[model samples]
Every structure is written in structure tokens, then in C-alpha cells.
Target chain A: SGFRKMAFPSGKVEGCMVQVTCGTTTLNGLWLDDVVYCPRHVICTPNYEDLLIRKSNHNFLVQAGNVQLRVIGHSMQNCVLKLKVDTANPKTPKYKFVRIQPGQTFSVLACYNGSPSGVYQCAMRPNFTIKGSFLNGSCGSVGFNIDYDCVSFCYMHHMELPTGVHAGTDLEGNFYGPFVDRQTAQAAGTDTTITVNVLAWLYAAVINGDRWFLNRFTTTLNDFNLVAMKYNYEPLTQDHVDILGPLSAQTGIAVLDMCASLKELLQNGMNGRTILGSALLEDEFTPFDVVRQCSGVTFQ
Target chain B: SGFRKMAFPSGKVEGCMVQVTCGTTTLNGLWLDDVVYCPRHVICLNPNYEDLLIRKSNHNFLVQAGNVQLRVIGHSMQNCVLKLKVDTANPKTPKYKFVRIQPGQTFSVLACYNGSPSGVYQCAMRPNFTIKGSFLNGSCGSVGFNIDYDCVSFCYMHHMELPTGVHAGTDLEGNFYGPFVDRQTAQAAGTDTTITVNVLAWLYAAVINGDRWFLNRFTTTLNDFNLVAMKYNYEPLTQDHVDILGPLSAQTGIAVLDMCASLKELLQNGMNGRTILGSALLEDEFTPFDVVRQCSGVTF
Candidate 1:
């Protein structure tokens, strides 16, 4: 009997464009050029979309307000996870431990005041078990490994006086003690009304919301204020429109794309993830560690 | 009438060789090839020798030495006359004396000096005859111009040497004879045979006995006289001479002699009484004239 030796094709075959036929069957969109084999019931080609899905399973995308953090997994295993407000002293660290699936994503809200601000750390250890078997062996073993990738996100808390209000004047039309201010004096009644309205706006935007939403809102407010100041405290003009129009558009598109990616990561349960947000309220934490943390987050 | 121009032949012609032909005649050793001419008798070239003998009417001869050229017109009439005269004061002055000599007669004159004699003379002879002269006045003493005419000559009262012939006679038959004897002994086999031996003996006695005695006596007398005379008459040695002696002899290695010379100069007479002994002696003499004359022969 005469037999034919079938050699598999070699070199870089495009995943979507290449079509491979063996006997009567044919496959498309499979990168199988690197697989050496004779034709039989073997189908060595892989789906490009399946590869993309698998890749997404090992990475995480997280977002908290304007900041986004991407966590990439190095191995296919569950890991022990923890979240905490990191202090300088490791001997008295305050944290809570939990379990994280391979593709899980999560976020935390941080709060701050004139005292220590938010400075949270999230860590992962490859010591958790899956399917009743130790995933990466026992804790403290050669295989047990953990890494904490931390970052602090912050919002600045500042106040702006009404346009015509002076710090040394009060509604009674007398000096209100010596206090430096960056506002012009206005009519007493008008200055008082503007001040009350400013307090009302702060309570409504900051006090009534959850710490997370409040932090996000305040950060957005500060960002807008910075952008305004960058424009020389003037009203928006055609020159402003010409210069910032393209930049704003480009920034908005990038942010939307990032938000979409975050949502996808949350649904996919990618591992090794963390989310950070600016602090909303001041607190009374005053140790060196707390002060360090507060300043770290405020600046970040 | 036809005239033809004869062009000179070209090329380097040796000065002593080559002849020039004019019409039917040729001139030899005339260096005529270097001359350019137009046909009619033309002498363009000078005679190579400045002293040219022109056998013309007066037997002219031209003598040229540097810028001075003399032409002598020889006798065609009258007696042969020649003159020689010298001015004793200005000896270089050219003076002439004319002498008329009878044909076939000879004439001569001799001149002498009491002091040292040195002078220049020029004489010209026409073809040639012979001239002789004699100027002898004394045997040994300094002569004061005396002329002696004699047929024979002999050394009389010679200081150093003796004559071998005592007397001699000339015979008529073309023969001359002499009685040979030393003048010192006047005998055939005397103490001195040759003139040289007798001269050497006489000189030895004069120098060793006579001259030495006189020189010793004179030197002693002069030294004694100078010492006493200079001590009183001459100025004492200046400090300049003493100071100069140290440095002069340090450089020249002749300290004692130099000092003596300098001292002698200080005692010397005259404005520049330079002695033949030392340079310093001559260079420093600035004193009375008699002092130099007294010590002129006195050298240390």
C-alpha cells in the first residue's frame, strides 16, 4: 500500500486570514503554523477570541473616581487578599483579610480632614486553596508569595470667599478682627448672603453623600477649579475655547474608554486589583505615620 | 668709388694667440681681433703693456704705475745727463740733478747716514753702461761724511774680525798676488788664521769684559742717581697705581713686575715716558721729564 506524508505548514500564519485544510475538513482563524503534525483528527489551531478571553481572565482593571489601577496576575491561582490603612509601624498594622478569586476586582473609599488622610494598601498572597487543594502550597513555604502594590489618591480641600467679601468685615459693618483674606469688600448684606449660600452648597455636596461619592465629587470640583485658575480667573472666552477645546475632547474620550474597561474588569472578576479615591472629611489621626499618610494622599 | 665694410670675425679669441689681417698685412700678437674698425686707418685698441717703447723721433718710453704715468724722452742730441737729489728734511720730496757725462765715461755718487738709514730711490738706464761709487771715510769710528778714492779695499782697525791678507799687488801681466797673513798677528802662522775667528774673539772680549763692565757701571750709577733724584723731584706714587696693580696682576699673573713698572712710571719724567719694559710703565708715566731721561736705561 502507498502512504503519503503530510507536512504541516510553517511560518507566521495570520489568525483571521489563514485557512488550513486537512483531507476534507478546513479550519479558519487559527494560528497553527507553529504546530508540526501529520493530518488526522487533530485540530491544533486555537481561536483568537478565546485567547483574548483567557488573557482577560488573568488581569484586573479598577477605577475609583478619576483614578484607575490595573492589576495583572502572573499565575492561574487564587490568592489571599487584604485591605488596610497602612501605618508606618508594621507591628501594629490594622487590616482585614479575605479571599480573592483569580479575576476579581474591588475598590475602597478613603476619608481625610486637616488630620491624617486616606492611605490604604491592598496586598495578595498565593496561599489560598481551590477545589480542596492548596493552590500554591502552605503559607511560609517556598511557593507562598504575596505582593502589596499600594497608592494614595487625594483631593484638596479649600474655600473661596465671595467676590466682594473681605475677611475683616462682617454684616454689622465693623471689623471682624484681623484676618487676611483674598476677597474685595462688598456691601455688608450682600457679603453675608453670599457666605450663607456658600455654606449651603458645601453641606449639600459634601455632608449629605457617602464618603466615596463625597470624595469623588470633591476631587471633581477641585479639578474644575484648577482648570479655571489655569485660565487666569477669567470667564471662558473664544481664546479659551480654541486652546482647551481639543484637549478637553481628547481627555473625555480617554476617560470614557477607561471607565468602560473598568466595568468590564469588574464583571470578569480579574485578580490582583485595587481601587483608590480621595478623602472627603478631616479626622484627628496625628501620629507621624498618620501625618505622613495624610500628606502622601493629599499630594498624590 | 666703391667702399666695402669689413666686419670683424666673431668668437672668443685667446689674448696671446690669433692675428688680425688688414688688406695685405697681418699684425701678430696684437690682440687686434678684439678691436672694431671702419676701413680707414683706425687704432681702437690700447697696447696691452702700459710701458710702451715708441721708437719715434725722441725715443719715447711710457711708464705707468697706478695713477702716475711718466714719459721719458731719450737723448737724440746733447750729452747723456742724469740727476739725483734728495731733500734731507722732507726726504720723500722728489728732486732731480742733471749730470752731463762725456761719451764712454762713467760717473757715480754714494750717500750715507750717521743715524739709521732708510730711503726710496728710482733710477733709469738708457740701454746700459756701468756705474760705480764709493763712500768710505774712516776705519772704525763714526764717519762725518768723507769721500775716499782708492784702487784697493781692506778692513782697517776692525772691531771683531781680522783680515787674512796683509798686503796685495796687481801685476802688469794680468795677474794679482797677495801676501796672506792675519791682521791681528801679522804673521804667516799666527794666533788667528781666518777673519771670522779673530772677529769672534774680539766680540767675546768686548761683550764679556768691555761692554759688560760699562753696562754694569752705568746701570748702577743710573739706578742710584734715579732713586735719590726721583725721591725729591718726582711726585709720590698715587693710590690709583697701587689699586690698579692688584687687579691687573690678578688677571695677568704678573703682579711684582707690574707693580715695579707702575712705580717706575710714577718716578718717570715726561708726560708719556713709556719704557720698553712693561705696558703699565709706559701707560702710567706722568711726571717730570728729567726723571724719565735719568731712568730711561734703568729697568728692573
Candidate 2:
């Protein structure tokens, strides 16, 4: 051919959308983009979700009864989470921070005690999210919800608490515990356990249950309960939604398309013939004998 | 006006012959392109002249006396350099093989040494050599010559012997000791000195030199030295001055009458300026202060 300059078609492709959640709090939306291609396909997702907001007192109160926390779920071992609470409105300046780890859950009673609780949120850093090769499936739903209400009168009486002993069992319980219970002469009843549940909600999170979806290949466990509660004290805001939406979607899409293209190219190149020669159409292929010889020389 | 690609009138320009020496070993012939644009007025000339080769036997010999080595020049610091040395008699198995780093003036001495000690050539890697930077001068002379010998020498020396002892009348002559005899020893005829010079030379080598003659800029310092010496050793193979008896005169006459056009297009865009500015026709000046100020912020 005569001398010529050629330009190839190349640029950024679309991304996939993913949502951020812990227990009952859907912190914000996010878009994921593909950045690296690892040997074993290790997808590392960094946590960028902003403060989690309690849209209504309803979602916040749901976590009020929580006592015991357990972090459980598939890929639960892979998640590292941090929690932050914006006691004031997200637009205002009051916020507290806490970190949550994988295989550990938290409870409202353990994290803090009291009512009229401010907004809260939890986030998972990369590698702590999922660790399976299937690539498809939603990581079940996760949000903060009370498994047991520590302030319920039934819980107090069942535990044989004396009158007036429940004074500081609210979000301010941390400050009221020793003083009120001691003054009331309430005997510590058999450990009243409160459980926080992180419902697996991947079916809804990953719209398409393709190989690239994370939830499908993961499992939920008890340890995740603690982690969920540990990071449930942050407020969710619109800004967080803005920051996370594009990131999560982009990441998911990039990974999916890259794997798709590679898969198709390989399949098309390997089509037919008893003896697949080194030259498969325009793409090159390795002969069986060559592969066998190469295998023989491997470290084994 | 509409977005049109930049354009300029094209024509030929004339200039004087010049020689550029990279270090002392390598020398290149070029045309000044413009009477006022000669390198002597723009570029600094090195004071050190490190000999790479000198005439001796029938082949080219590497000189060992110089402290400098080969290096890249001009805006070619990033390009790769390939050097080849061949024994013309044995075309199937020529000699040296070397690839040099960009902007570095060095070659594997051992490899070049092992290769045919006779013929050396410099070349670029593929497309890197296909295009050359535009030059201002168009008219120049080029010539090639054969060199039969080359020489090499060194500068350092150490003494291995020293005379000693004294005797008789005036403390014997206070025999001195050293590799070289003292002046007294020479006068007394008692000692003599021998100098060891590491030098080599050869003949039957080709040396090509010309004003503005195009050649691979990859020529190494050593090869350049050989070429320089070959130029000195060149002997015209023919004395037939009458060979220009035919169309040469007519061609020369036609060339003399070629149209003379403005040479502004021959210069780079930044170097060229509008012939008229603010109703005054004059050459524009370089913004040296701007350039210097901008350069101040650069890390390098």
C-alpha cells in the first residue's frame, strides 16, 4: 500500500452504576470505572461515598433498638468500612467520625445510646467489598437497622432492670449509663442481645446480574453485622450522590466492556479446524504441541 | 478568514560550507544556509580536539589518546543510533554492532573492536532516519575519498624503573632512579628512556566529506575521526577534467537563471515574521526575555 497514516478508534467507553449502602442507609449513588487489569482480576474499589443522611427520622429510628452487631456476608472478609456521623444537618458544620472493619458489626447501644439521633453513614474501602471470580451478581443490600431495641421496656424488664434505670439508654446513653442504672439499683439482667441485620440486597443493586456484577458471587455472614453497625453514623447528602454516581458507574462499565471485548476476540480467533494452526485468521494462535512443550518447562 | 492550513511561498536559498565537530572525534560538514546564520555566530565551538583516528597502515585504526567519546547532537537526543563495521571482503559476516543511548556519546568499545576493524558505518533505526529536519541551504558540494592508514595515541605514562647508588669522588653521580633517565644520565650516557604510546592506524578506508551533504547523524565519534583522516588521505581516482564536455555547461547555464524568490518560507514559522508591521517594513526580533522568563520555571 502507498505510504499512509492511520488513526485507530479508541477512547473512553461508558461505565456502570453502583449504589453505596450499609445496613439500611443507602449513602449515595456511584459509578465505577476500570483502571487496572490484574492477573487474577482483583477489582479494588476505593470508598468515596459521602456522609449518609437519614432522609427521614424513620430510617434513623430503625437503628435505635440495635444492641449486638455482627459483620456477616459473602466477601465480608474483603470489606473495610469507616463511619461518620453528621449530628447537624449536612449543610451545617457538626460531624463525628468512626472506622469500621471487616468481619465486625456494631449496634446502636454499643456505638452510642439515646434518641433524636443525628444522620449517620457507613462506607467500604476497596478490597473489602468482594473477592470472587464470577464477576456477576449484586453484593446483597446492606443498611443499618436495629435487630433489637435496647430501650424497649420489654427488653429492660426482661433483663430485670429496676425502675428509672433506663434514663440514659438513648443516643446519649454513653453519658447516662453508669449514673442512671446505679441510681436506680437495677440489676444487670442476663445479657440482652441486640442484633443488626445487613439484608442481602444485591438483586436490586446490580440491575443486570452479569458476570461483572459483584453481589452474585458474594455471601453474607454474621461478622458483617458488627461492621454494618460500626459505620452507620454518617449523613448522606446530594454532594455525596454527585461524587459517587459517576465513579461507581464508570468503574463497573469499564470492567465489563474490557472483559467482554477480550472474551469475544479470543473466541473469534479460536474458531474451528482439527489442527488450529499458529495463524488463526489474522490473529495468531499457539499450536497444541507448542503449548504442551511450554507446559513441560513450567516450574510446576 | 476561513480556517485554512498555514502556507508559505517555497524557494531555494544559498549559503557557505561549514564543519561541525561533535567533541573532537566526530565532525560533520554542513552548509551555513544563510550568510548571517552560520553556527560560528550562534553555537559555541568546543576548544578540546580529541583525536579518534590518525593515518597509519592500509586500514583505519582507533585512537586511544582522547578523553572525549561519541555523543548525540542537535535535537536528536532521543533517537537511537546503530553502528556497523564491516570487512568488505567478507560481506556475509561484517563486523561491529552497536546501539547507543540518546544524547549519549558512547559505543561498546569491545564490540566495535571485535567487529571488522576495517569498515564502519552509522545508520538510524527505520523511520527515525526517513525524515530530516528542514535545512536553509540547498546548494553544496559532496565528495568521498579512501584512506589507507589511521593512527591512535595516548597521554598518560608511569615510571617502572629508577637508578640508584653513589660511588667514588662526588657521591658517585648520585645515580637517579625512574622510568625515564635524568638529563644527567643522558649527558653521562649511563641511562636511557623509552616512551610507550598506545596508538594505532590503518589504511584502505573511505572518507567522505561534503558541505551540507546528508548522512545518518548516527555516525559515531570514532567513525567521524576515521572519515576526517580519510578525507586527508583521499587521492583523486581520476584526472579527466574534460569529462564535463557534454550537457554540463547547458545545465549550469539553466540553473544560474532559476527564479529568485523570497526565502522567508525556508525559515521556521516562529523564526519568520511579517515583512511589514505598524506601517513599517522591518524584521521582527526574538522575544529572548520571554523565553528566558518561561525557562526559569522549568525544572530542568
Candidate 3:
């Protein structure tokens, strides 16, 4: 339930042809000047802890060798915590009692020693009758009586996506976005659109920050190197000029230059000072700028 | 509970501008005074479930699996029944039972089963009487084979710590036996075609060490060894032994004769002496006397 919430306008815009490029690859550079574009922005604050808590409560069991307890004192009064363990010897059950201040922890071992290893039946009560009463209205009583033998190894591995954010639908009714995979995008007829890929990468970079992007970018580059080796192409270790010689001649800029600009913008472009206008029309335009500019579009 | 708790300032303010744009276009590009944004916060708690009691009782196993106790907390005490069903070995037949539960009260139920039943158990609270309907869809239960039998098999197969008197160590030929390498290799190969021999080797090493390590590692390995004995008929080391060893020995082309000799020597030197392995081999119908002669002239 712990989440940070914010709202944004849901609107559409039209008559925009954004020149988009990354590295030496031009995405939407050929689109008509009057092409339609719509912009929607939503705020997302990932509550990883909340997700973990929900998972833990539903899947975790309170048993021996795996007991965790915490006490939070709301008032100024100190409380006595008593833990009683049921033993095989009925005449001599084990009892542990400790006085705890506000926001203190009461620790107890769950395992018992015997010919056969077993777990003890433990009960915990706060304000342990020392101050004249066994049950106090100020604090609730919780107990552990169930004996289970399986440990839960389940956990949440990913953060939940924000609400109100849906995948993009192309002209052909194809959907693509944060949740959609490349194969699904291709089946939906949107995978071939370089602009979509560029835009998607930009959105991820912004949301997760530049450091995350750089890590992924390094992986991508390594993949390209592997591809080059597999296909017997010039190694990626060579200059970009050798890799994109013909394309560089057509674009009037070396592929290396394009890569440098793209890298610079991706590294330092989003400083909270550069507006959407600068992201779109700054001198020496870079692919990073193209993505930033397109992502910046808003509803009227 | 093992969760880090933090508090955030709950405040709302206007005039904090948010820019909007898309595809070389911008909307609400100017600092607008009419825009509004609000923030919400939450507190998270994490639960720990790692302890369990693995008891080995011969009689009440069936009855224990049938009866489940649950504590329910709600606002009103009304008509509510917790329904449970067990899908036994026979998929065509399922056992179902119900127990009435009081609101804010604890209740228990025991299911009826024929013979040694093993299956998945599920439970759900019926009737829509609570404010949160989602919470009713909590967790279900499951029951496996006998804990003693299964626990023994589990420990041996998993290479869990063993008990005193029995040790884990290499065979007479000096190659390992109880480390469960065969099981690990099978797992790594992503197949169940063969058991893990690495762990078996480790168990053998521990037995040869014949110290605390042997005592600590023998119990679980003994279970697995018993399981292996139950599965395959062990004969004098020969083509028959190789055939039963599966891909485990085949991969290394290790002579079954050498393996047997090593194991024979280890058993001879163990705390229990040759008795433990001798009994295990005898149970498998393996003749160690005939195999020790073949070990004299063979390489690993």
C-alpha cells in the first residue's frame, strides 16, 4: 500500500513529423511534415518493498530456524515481552522473558534439541503480566502455534509497472510498449519501425536514468561485436567509418561522428534544464535528442 | 518481520511545473499555473518464513494431512465455511470437505483419505461478507510422501548433513563416492536421467575423514544411498555396474572395478567399518569380493 501517486493530462496532438535518429541510423527522418503525433505522460514510483512484503506474507511461513519478530511501541510506556516454548517435558517448559523499550526487538530460537530434531511450540505475549495485567488494550497479542516443515523460496523479481500506462497501438492496430516483446511487436507490424525502437529505448533511459541505459548499451555493443565475428564482417573494434562507410557518405557525416554525438547526449543531455525544444532542435542534432524531443511531446 | 521502515514527508504544492512534448512537438510547453500534482506515501512491512518441523511419525500421517487449522480475522461473525479439496494420485477422484469458521476466530478441519494419500490440497473461504474480497483468496496447502522416508531420500539426494557413526568419504580406490556429483551433473545437464555423483563423492570423502564432518554428512547421504539401492540392483563390478551407473560413470570412463575397490577400502576404514557400505552393497546385491580383484590392475 506504500506508493507515491501523481497525475498527468491525457491528450492528443497532430501535425508533427519528428526526425529521429540514433547512431548513424535514421528512424522517422523520412516522415511527412504533417504526420500526426500524440503525447501522454504518467508518473510512476516503484514500491519494491511493498511488492516484497505482499509476497513474503502470502508465501512465507513462521517456523523454527526461521523466526523473525519486531515490536513497535507507540506510547511512552515500556512493555515486557514473554515467550513460552512448549517442551517434550511437560513439567519443565521453557520460558524467556525480556523487558523492551519502544521500537525494540525480542529474539527467540525456534529449534529444539532432542534425539530427533524438532521445532518448539512458541507463544509470545507483550506486557507479560509484570505490571498487574496479562492482556493489555494498548497492544495486540500475536502467537505462533502452527508447526510446518517447508520453507517458502518464492520472491518477486520485478517492479510493477505504473497504472494508466498502456502499450502503443500502431496504424495497423499493433500494440507495443514496456510490456510487449520484440516478437509480439513484429507480429503486430510495429517492429520494423526504427522510430518505435528508438522512442522505446529513449523512454526506458529517461525512466531508469542514464546509468541503466549505459549498462544495457554496453551489452548491445557486445552483441554487435559477436554478430560481426559470426558473420565475418569487419570487427567492431575498427572505426565506425568502416562499418557504415556508404551510409556515412549519404548522411554527410561520419558514422563515428554520429555515435559520438549520440553518446554525448545520452550521457549529459537530460540535465533538467534542456527543454523539449532544445532536445529536438539543438545544433549538431543527435539520436538521443530525437528520442528526448519525441518523448517530450504533450497534449494540447 | 525483517523490513527496513522509512517515512516520507506528506506535502502538496502547486507551481511545480512538468513539461510535456512528443515527436518534435510540445503541448503545455509553458509554465502553466493551473496544473496540479499531489503526492501519497505508504509504510511497508516484510515477513520471514523459513522454519519448519520435519517430524517422522508412522501412524497419524494420514490424519495430519487431512486436518488443517486456520485463524480468521474479520469484522463480523456470520455464515462462513472454509472449503478444502485434495487432488489425490487418482486425478479422476478428488476428496472435498468443509468446516464452518467464526469471524475473528480460529478453526481446524481434517480431510478423509484412503490409504497413503499424496496430493495437492487447496482451501478457500466462501461467501462475500468481508470488505476486502481479495484477501480471502489466501494460500492453499500441499502434502507429499512420508517425511521420514522422503526426508531421508531428500537429505541423501541433496547431500544434506549426516549423523554420527556413519561417515562420507572416497572409496578404497581414492575416488570420491558421497559428494553427489552424479545428481549435480544431472541437474546441470537439465535432465533427470542420472543421479548426482558429486554429492555422493563428498559423502564418501566425509566418511573417509571419519570425524565430525563424517558424522555431519552421513545421515542425508544414507537416505539417498538407500534410495539408490532401492532403484538399482547392484552386482559385482563389471559391465552390469557400468550399465546401472548410467551416464555418470560413462562420462569419465571410470572403471566400475576401481570405484568398487575404493568404496570397499573406505568402508573398511570408516567408523562403522565395512558394515555400513557392506549392508548397502548387500541390499543392492552387489558382491564387493569379486570386484576388488578387478581393481588391482585398472586405472581410474
Question: Candidate order by lDDT, highest to lowest?
Answer: 3, 1, 2
lDDT of candidate 3 at residue A184, scale 0 to 100 = 34
Could you give candidate 3's per-residue lDDT for residues A115-190 as a string of tens digits? 1111111111111111000111101111111002111111100111121112222222122233331223221111
Residue-level lDDT for A134 in candidate 3: 11
lDDT of 1 by residue, B1-300 (tens): 000010001001111111222234222111111221111111113332112212232212222212232233331211110111111122121122212321122111111111111110111111111111111211111011101121111111111111322222111111212232212344231231111111112222222211221111111222443363345433233334334334323433333233343333334442242222211111111111111111121110
Count clashing residue pairs per candidate.
Answer: 16, 116, 60
Ranking by TM-score: 3, 2, 1
After superposing all C-alphas onto the true structure, candidate 2 shows an RMSD in angstroms of 38.2
Which ten contiguous residues of candidate 2 chain B have the minimum total lDDT?
Answer: B196-205
Ten-residue segment with the worst summed lDDT in candidate 2 chain A? A5-14
RMSD of each: 66.4, 38.2, 32.9
Q: Candidate 2, residues B66-95: lDDT per residue as tens digits? A: 222112212211011111121222211112
What would the per-residue lDDT of candidate 1 be over residues A1-300, giving only the tens digit for each residue?
000010001001111012222233332111111211111111212332343345441232222212332323212111111111111211111222233321111111111110111111211111111101001101110000111211111111111123211121111112222322223343322111111111122222222121122222122323433443442221223332343233224333222222233223323432322212111111111111121221211100
Each prediction's DockQ against the real complex: 0.00, 0.01, 0.01
